[PDB]
Symmetry: D2
C-alpha cells in the first residue's frame, strides 16, 4: 500500500544531507536505490552508506551537466539493475544558476522518460534549493530558483501525464544540513525568526515527502510543488 518493492530509484547528489536522506528513505520503502555523486570517492561513500543501512543498490559517478555522462550512466543502470522508474533530481549569478539547473533537470528527465514510457509508470521528483545564502543576493537567487522549478515542474507534468508519469517538486525551507550548520549565528537567528514552527527542518522531513510522492497513493498528484518550510514563505 505504501511500498516500493521491485522499483528502481535514481537519486542524484546522494552523498550528503537531503540526497542521502532521500536515498535511505526510498530504500526503507523497499526500493532498489542507485545514488549518484560527481566523484568516485562519493560514489563509494554512497555505496557504503546503503550497505550499512541494509538498502540494495549502488553508488555511481554521474555528471548531470553532460549528455555523455547521463547516457552512459543510464546504460550502466539498465544493463546491471534495471530501468529507473523513480527519479529524484537533487544535483545542482542568478540567471546562469537557474538556466543551468533547469537545463540539467531537462537533460536528465528526458533520458529516463523512455524507460517510464515503456513501463507506463513513473515518478520524477525535483528537489529545490535550501534557504541559507547571504543577504539580498541569497533572497533573489532563492526566489528565482524556486519559481523556475515550480513552472518547469508543471510544464513537464503536463507533457508526460498521459503516460501515467507524475512530476512533482519539493521546495525546502531552512533545513539542517552541513551547509546550514555552519552559518553565522545572526543569519541563523534572523532565519529562525521568520519560521512559524520556530525551528530548522531535518533532512529526513524532506525525505518523507519525497517518499510519499514516489508511492502509488500520490498517483493523482502531479505538476505540484510541495513546500516543506515550516510555514516560512520567501518570494
Amino acid at each position: 500500500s505504501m511500498s516500493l518493492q521491485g522499483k528502481v530509484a535514481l537519486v542524484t547528489g546522494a552523498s550528503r544531507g537531503i540526497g542521502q536522506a532521500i536515498a535511505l528513505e526510498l530504500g526503507r520503502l523497499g526500493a532498489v536505490v542507485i545514488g549518484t555523486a560527481t566523484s568516485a570517492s562519493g560514489a563509494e561513500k554512497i555505496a557504503e552508506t546503503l550497505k550499512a543501512n541494509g538498502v540494495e543498490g549502488a553508488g555511481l559517478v554521474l555528471d548531470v551537466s553532460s549528455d555523455e555522462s547521463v547516457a552512459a550512466t543510464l546504460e550502466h543502470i539498465q544493463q546491471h539493475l534495471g530501468q529507473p522508474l523513480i527519479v529524484v533530481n537533487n544535483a545542482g549569478e542568478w540567471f546562469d544558476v537557474v538556466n543551468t539547473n533547469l537545463n540539467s533537470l531537462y537533460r536528465l528527465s528526458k533520458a529516463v522518460l523512455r524507460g517510464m514510457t515503456k513501463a507506463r509508470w513513473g515518478r520524477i521528483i525535483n528537489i529545490g534549493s535550501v534557504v541559507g545564502a547571504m543577504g539580498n543576493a541569497g533572497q533573489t537567487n532563492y526566489a528565482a530558483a524556486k519559481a523556475g522549478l515550480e513552472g518547469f515542474t508543471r510544464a513537464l507534468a503536463r507533457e508526460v501525464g498521459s503516460r501515467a508519469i507524475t512530476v512533482n517538486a519539493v521546495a525546502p525551507g531552512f533545513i539542517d544540513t552541513d551547509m546550514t550548520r555552519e552559518l553565522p549565528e545572526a543569519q541563523r537567528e534572523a532565519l529562525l525568526g521568520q519560521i512559524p514552527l520556530g525551528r530548522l527542518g531535518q533532512a529526513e522531513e524532506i525525505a518523507k515527502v519525497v517518499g510519499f510522492l514516489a508511492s502509488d497513493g500520490a498517483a493523482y498528484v502531479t505538476g505540484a510543488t510541495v513546500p516543506v518550510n515550516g510555514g516560512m514563505y520567501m518570494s
Copy 2:
C-alpha cells in the same frame, strides 16, 4: 513509519465520498475516528461504515455553522473519547458565477469557527494536525470555473494565515485542493462532455476519493511535521485558477 494509534481524529462531512474515504484512511492508520454529518441518518451511516471496516470511533451530528453545535460536539468527544488532535475540515454547504461570494464567505467562517474550537486541545498537547479539504470542481463551464478558483484561493490564503498563527505550538495547518474527482456530477454528465473533460486532465482520468485520502493520511503523520501552510493540489495536472 506512519502511524496514528493513540490519536483521535475528527472528520467533518464523513458520510459520503471524500470525507468517507478520509475517515477510513485515518482509521487504517490506526486513528480513532469521529466522523460527522449534519443529519442523524448520516451520523448512523457513518457509524455503520466504521464498524464494518473495523475502525474504532463514532458518527455524530455536527452543524459547523453553529457555535452551540460545535461547542456541544467537542464536549461530547472530550468526555467520551478524548481530545481530537487531528481535524479534517470537509464540511461545506444550476450553478452561476455569482454564487462564489456566499459559498466562500460561509465556508471560511465555519473553518475558522471549528479550527478555533479544537485549538485549545492541540495547544495543551503541543501537537496538532488541521487539514482543510477544498471543493471539487462543481460544474463545467464558466460559473464552474469562477466558483472553483475562488473557493481554492480563499482556502489557500486562510490555510497559510492560520498555519502562521498557530505554528509556534507545533500544530500544522494544511489544505488539499482536489481537482476532478468521480462525483455524481461527473457521473451524470453528457458523454461528449466527459471525454472533453478528461482531455483537460494530463493524467487522462478522474481522481478517486481514495487518492485524496492518502494525501490527508500523510499530512496527518509525523513525517509531515515540517509541512505547514501548504495547499497540496490533487488534480491530475489540471490547474484552474
Copy 3:
C-alpha cells in the same frame, strides 16, 4: 456640522466629468487618489466615517480645484451604503469609478480580512446597478500597506476576491482590479528612527519608500479607457519588495 459638503469652461482630461467615488479619502493614499482622479477631470466624491473628515475632504478638493464632495459613509453598514448612493445619485450622478480604500484594523488577521472583503462586496454590489445601465465601470480595490502574516493574508484575500468579481461582472464592460501597495511613506513611517529605517529600505530593491502619489497614478491609469482590457488583476506597487 453637515455630513455632506461640496466644492463656461470645458475640461479635456482623461475622465469626462465621470463621477468617481473614493472611500477613505481624508488622508494619505485615499486623499492622493481623490486628487489624482480630480486632476484627470473626474468629479470626485471622497468619503470618510466622520463629519469633520467629510469637511476636510471637501476643503481639500476645493483648494485643489477639484469638483465634488465630502460625504460621511460607513462601508460596514448596508443602510449607510444604500442611503449614501441614493444621495450621490440624486445630487451629483451615478458613480462609474469606485475606489475601495476604506478598511478597518484592530485571531485578528481573520476578522480584518473577513470584514474588509464583506465590505468590498457590499459596496461593489451597490454601485453595480449604475455601471450596468451605463455599460461601463471601474472598480479598483486598494490593498493594505505593510505584520507579515496580516499583510500576506489581506493581499491573498484581495487577489482572489478581485479576480472572482472581475469574472462575474465582465460581460457588462465593468473592470475590477486591485492595487497592492508595499512600504509607503506615511506619517506612521516618517517617524521611524535612524536605525529601523535602513533595515526596512534594505529589503526594498528600489532602496526607498513609495509615495502615496505613486499608488494614485496607478489607480488613475486603471480608471482610464486605456486599461479597458485589464481586469481581474492585482498590480503590486512595492518597489520590488514581495512578501507572501
Copy 4:
C-alpha cells in the same frame, strides 16, 4: 509629465501587431522610437510606419538571439540617435522547453546590453511583453502557462538586481489579442473562445500598448518586478 519627450525607446519586433502598436504609442507620448525587425523589409516597413504617424526614430534589423547583432545594433543607436532608456522586449527569436529557454536567454542578452546606458543615466524602463495565447487545446495551454511563468520569475529577478539604479523591470502578459492567430479562427471556434473571456471580446493590440505606455512613465516609478495581465479576465495558469 506622463510624457516621454527626449527619451529614446527601443521596441523589438515592431513590424506588426503588438510591437507596432507599442512603437506608435511610445511615439505619441513623445519618445524617439527605434523599432526593430529581423529582416530588411521589416525595418523599412517600420520606418515608413513611424514617418506616416509623425513619430521620430528608425527601423533597424536586429536579431535578438545573436550577441554580434545586439552589440552592433546598440553601437549604431548610440552613435547615431542616443542611449535607449526605454526598452520593450517583444521579439520572438518538448517544444515548451526550447521556446522558454531561448526566449529568456534573449531577454537576458538584450537586457544586459542596454543596462550600461541606463546605469549611467540612473534611470531606465525595461518592459517585457509575454506571448499571446498561441493556439488552443492542451499544447497551447502548456506552452502559454510556461512562457508566462518563466517571464514572471525572470522579470522579478531582474527587477531585483537592477533596482538600486532606479531602473524598473516589468512584464505585460497578454491574453487573447486580435492578431493573425485569432483572425483566422472558424465560426463555432471563435464564439467558444469569447465565452471563456469575461469581457466577451478579444483584446486590441492598442490596449497592450497603453499599459506599456503607462509602465514607461514616471508615474510607474515604484512599480517593478510586476507582471501586469492584460487578458480581459481570462486567466490560464
